[PDB]
Amino acid sequence: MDERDALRISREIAGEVRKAIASMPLRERVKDVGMGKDGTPTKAADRVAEDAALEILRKERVTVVTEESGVLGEGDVFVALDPLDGTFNATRGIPVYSVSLCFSYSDKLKDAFFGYVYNLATGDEYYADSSGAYRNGERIEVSDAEELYCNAIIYYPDRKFPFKRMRIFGSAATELCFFADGSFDCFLDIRPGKMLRIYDAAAGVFIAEKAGGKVTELDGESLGNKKFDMQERLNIVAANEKLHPKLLELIK
Amino acid sequence: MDERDALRISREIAGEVRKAIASMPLRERVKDVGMGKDGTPTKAADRVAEDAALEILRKERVTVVTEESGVLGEGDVFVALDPLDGTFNATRGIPVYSVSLCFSYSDKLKDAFFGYVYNLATGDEYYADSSGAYRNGERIEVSDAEELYCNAIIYYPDRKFPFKRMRIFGSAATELCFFADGSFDCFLDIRPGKMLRIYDAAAGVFIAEKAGGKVTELDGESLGNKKFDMQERLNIVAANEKLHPKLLELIK
Ligand SMILES: O=P(O)(O)OC[C@H]1O[C@](O)(COP(=O)(O)O)[C@@H](O)[C@@H]1O
Ligand SMILES: O=P(O)(O)OC[C@H]1O[C@](O)(COP(=O)(O)O)[C@@H](O)[C@@H]1O
Ligand SMILES: [Ca+2]
Ligand SMILES: [Ca+2]
Ligand SMILES: [Ca+2]
Ligand SMILES: [Ca+2]
Ligand SMILES: [Ca+2]
Ligand SMILES: [Ca+2]
């Protein structure tokens, strides 16, 4: 498979996935209807999203890692896919939830070759191949923010914070693309329990990085050997190369 | 003026402002075109939105008090306009921003008769009148949650809180409707410096107060004395009857 393929497939699934949900009333979205392989409940939207996202990516040959359905496939290539990031927003009809496909030639994040987040309430499009990162056709790049008094997104503020502004929108995938295009000066998942799964942020990272971004763990060590498995989880700090050492500093 | 006019007018305003703001690209949008008469910079979006509002507003026998031009009008019907709160999100393509309006038969909140707040990005039209709270033409109502383990919109999480989750979309006016409609169970703007201004809170308080919401200043004082001008500031502890007093202590 090629990085051109991933778009092709990512865009099919995005369209399919968007519509299934578009036609599903908020009353219908919020009903729990099962429990996921991830060990969390399944909402009705989640259900339809998966099934849509999974009718396509099963037509292909990959090893796709998902929530409701666990690890399926034998494929050479691994896809960390979430067909509806921010279910609570969707369930609410609050327009911050997307599809998030991340493909890799190997088992680890290091061998990522395409990232793709699509807002299914807006139809906004974020992806990145080996030729940059884009927000709907035009290429993106992070931000020259040099100091901490900056517009940041954080999970979760616990005390005094120098930031120009903080935000929590409810879609870490989406959010990580908010960073990537200059909207925010960083992303922060500092939740000591470490509660971000690979399908949760694998993509978002990739594009942020492709947009020129310092995206690491709490210790600033690489994320490269993160796993397309269900038990993989991560904390996240992301900013431009020159901001990072301070927030690293800062929250240390 | 009566409840039905205001609803028509409001709709009117939302119309052009949406047409107006939607034509502008982020790049023009984020332009610092000058200074609003409230002590903060006017971005072109701000000016464009406020522009097309007053065009529709000051033909009416009403006094207006708004972010950019301040107080302007000649009648006893007071209006609390924010032609676009969520400017930040508006200049970076974040679909949570709205024009807010509230009409009163005096310059005190306690004489408001109309509450209108419209998600300029998605078309979510919230509103309040005698008949009750509506959303996209559908009666709405605050949750019924009674524990501290809720979904909390808060300015700001200065510490460890017991909430089940924290969100901050960065538009009061619309985030009050996520509580009004009970999409979230509680809206807290407990910024130490009384930061919120009348045109951020008027439509929201009324709309949510009508949704069943119980809405008070930080300490619990009634907001009915809250006056329609350029200098008031508000803290806001909104929550259903059962939850509200719980919060008045937790933050104490
Ligand atoms: O939804 P929570 O658990 O309150 O916290 C928000 C975080 O968890 C997630 O919402 C999890 O994703 P979901 O929408 O699929 O549940 C992240 O997107 C976000 O970063
Ligand atoms: O952005 P801050 O200064 O951190 O404070 C949050 C405030 O942002 C605001 O959206 C500002 O309003 P504007 O976007 O219309 O200027 C308020 O609604 C909210 O109360
Ligand atoms: Ca789930
Ligand atoms: Ca999900
Ligand atoms: Ca997720
Ligand atoms: Ca301003
Ligand atoms: Ca404003
Ligand atoms: Ca404002």
UniProtKB/Swiss-Prot annotation, chains A, B:
Query: What InterPro entries does UniProt report for this protein, alphabetically?
Result: Inositol_monophosphatase-like, Inositol_monophosphatase_CS
Q: Does the keyword Manganese apply?
A: yes
What does the entry report regarding how activity is regulated?
A: Both FBPase and IMPase activities are inhibited by Ca(2+). In contrast to mammalian I-1-P phosphatases, is only very weakly inhibited by Li(+) (with an IC(50) of about 290 mM).
> Residues that bind Mg(2+) 2, according to the entry?
82, 85, 200
Instruction: Detail which positions bind Mg(2+) 1.
Output: 67, 82, 84
Q: What is its EC number?
A: 3.1.3.11, 3.1.3.25
Q: Which PANTHER family match?
A: INOSITOL MONOPHOSPHATASE, INOSITOL-1-MONOPHOSPHATASE-RELATED
Q: Which family does it belong to?
A: Belongs to the inositol monophosphatase superfamily. FBPase class 4 family.
This chain belongs to the protein called Fructose-1,6-bisphosphatase/inositol-1-monophosphatase
Native species: Archaeoglobus fulgidus (strain ATCC 49558 / DSM 4304 / JCM 9628 / NBRC 100126 / VC-16)
